[PDB]
Design a protein around this ligand. Structure first.
Ligand SMILES: [Zn+2]
Ligand SMILES: [Zn+2]
Ligand SMILES: [Zn+2]
Length: 78
């Protein structure tokens, strides 16, 4: 019925990359997790660049990669 993530095998406790903080490949230190609305992806304070010592006062949270001008190159030659 819901978003049944095949990577999790439905179970949250299994090491599934696409629901973890990919920057260190883990879900640990939940206190320091910062989720990115548009990336659908968990991060950590100590996994940011510049690494924040504390949570920002911004309710909506975008990672540095969201304002990075060096975007991924959409591969041509279809
Ligand atoms: Zn998952
Ligand atoms: Zn992390
Ligand atoms: Zn982001």
């Amino acid at each position: 019925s819901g978003p049944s993530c095949r990577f999790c095998k439905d179970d949250e406790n299994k090491p599934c990359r696409k629901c973890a903080c990919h920057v260190c490949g883990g879900r640990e230190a939940p206190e320091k997790q910062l989720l990115c609305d548009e990336c659908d992806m968990a991060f950590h304070l100590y996994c940011l660049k510049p690494p924040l010592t504390s949570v920002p006062p911004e309710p909506e949270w975008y990672c540095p990669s969201c304002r990075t001008d060096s975007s991924e190159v959409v591969q041509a030659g279809e």
